[PDB]
């Protein structure tokens, strides 16, 4: 029924339009630190303590970033399905005739 068709005498017999949609996002700030004294560095048995501490800080920062990304992805799910007969988070239960 809605096929676009033209005759020989093509005039004004078809017309279409377009639309666009917008999206947005925001930015946040994080950080942490640690302190030390000079004797702890100068008299410790381990020669390369600073390298280990800096590496641990970097690894912790990357892990925190990954966790925040995962929770943000979970919060923004388009469709949510509940297993079993549950209809809400409070309804979800593991005891009864129909476990979720």
């Amino acid at each position: 029924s809605k096929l676009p068709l033209l005759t020989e005498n093509g005039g004004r017999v078809n017309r279409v339009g377009f639309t666009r949609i917008a999206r947005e996002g925001s930015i946040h700030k994080f950080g942490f630190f640690y302190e030390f004294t000079q004797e702890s560095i100068d008299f410790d048995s381990d020669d390369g303590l600073m390298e280990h501490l800096s590496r641990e800080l970097m690894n912790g920062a990357t892990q925190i970033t990954e966790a925040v990304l995962q929770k943000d992805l979970l919060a923004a799910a388009g469709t949510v399905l509940y297993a079993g007969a549950a209809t809400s988070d409070a309804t979800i239960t593991g005891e009864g005739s129909t476990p979720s």
């Binding site: 943000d72 799910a77 388009g78 949510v80 809400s88």
Partner: protein, 278 residues
């Protein structure tokens, strides 16, 4: 909320308490401050307020004041202890705008942590029509209204509006988040009638002639498109003068007399009563 700060010189421990609370450990009260700070809620925290309060008191005697060299300016040794009621933190906020076509399912999720368990959630809905107020979503009809996640099935033109979630604890701390839902309809229903806000009864009554009232209009049928509005001046222009810019209508009362104005889109008319008091 207002927090009170107590300082103990010997142990270099600063205690933050509620307004009513107090300590009997020999500590001296230094001052009080507002935690949200009411002007820059996100910029400052407890630590900055405690530092600003401690900057004024003297090191030898915390009760008395002193100038710069004699203050308490070293915060490395000072440890801050919190005894006040915890404040809720919003882990995730609702998206500002959610767009969907009719006949689809939309889901909202809000994350709140902190405070004292257990948390309680309430959801409220406000319509696009002018004059609408926040009304609670019925929990019986929608089981998801009690929980954090709210799911609405088969949205229509009436479903459009703003949605808000309210979180409360046993202590009483409350935080809220808001979101907007936009629903597009293929064929908009024809307009049936037009209503008004800041009431068509008396509008805003101002004794000053210079003050100008503001009027807004909307159509009751959900999803209906309202055309450009036009105003008809009516018999007493000396009592008040009305000018319209787009949908917004402004009225300036020249004289202290009541008048009526009719605004129409070409098919329907709105009767608004204007009251002016000297």
């Amino acid at each position: 909320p207002v927090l009170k700060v107590m300082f103990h010189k010997d142990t270099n421990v600063a205690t933050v308490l509620d307004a009513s609370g107090s300590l009997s450990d020999g500590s001296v009260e230094v001052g009080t401050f507002h935690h949200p700070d009411e002007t820059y809620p996100d910029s400052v925290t407890i630590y900055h307020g405690v530092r600003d309060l401690l900057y004024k008191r003297s090191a030898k005697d915390p009760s008395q004041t002193a100038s710069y060299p004699n203050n308490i300016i070293n915060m490395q040794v000072i440890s801050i202890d919190m005894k006040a009621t915890p404040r809720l933190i919003l882990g995730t906020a609702l998206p500002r705008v959610i767009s969907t076509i009719e006949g689809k399912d939309v889901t909202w999720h809000v994350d709140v942590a902190g405070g004292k368990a257990p948390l309680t959630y309430k959801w409220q809905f406000k319509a696009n029509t002018v004059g609408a107020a926040f009304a609670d979503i019925d929990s019986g009809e929608n089981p998801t209204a009690k929980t954090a996640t709210l799911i609405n099935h088969a949205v229509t033109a009436e479903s459009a509006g703003t949605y808000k979630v309210i979180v409360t604890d046993a202590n009483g701390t409350t935080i809220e988040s808001s979101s907007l839902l936009v629903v597009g309809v293929q064929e908009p229903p024809e307009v049936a009638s037009i209503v008004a806000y800041p009431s068509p009864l008396a509008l805003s009554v101002a004794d000053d002639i210079t003050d100008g009232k503001t009027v807004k209009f909307s159509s009751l049928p959900a999803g209906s498109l309202i055309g450009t509005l036009s105003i008809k001046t009516q018999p007493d222009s000396g009592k008040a003068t009305a000018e319209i810019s787009g949908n917004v209508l402004t009225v300036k009362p020249v004289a202290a007399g009541d008048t009526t104005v009719v605004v129409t889109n070409g098919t329907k008319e709105v009767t608004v009563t204007v009251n002016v008091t000297e």
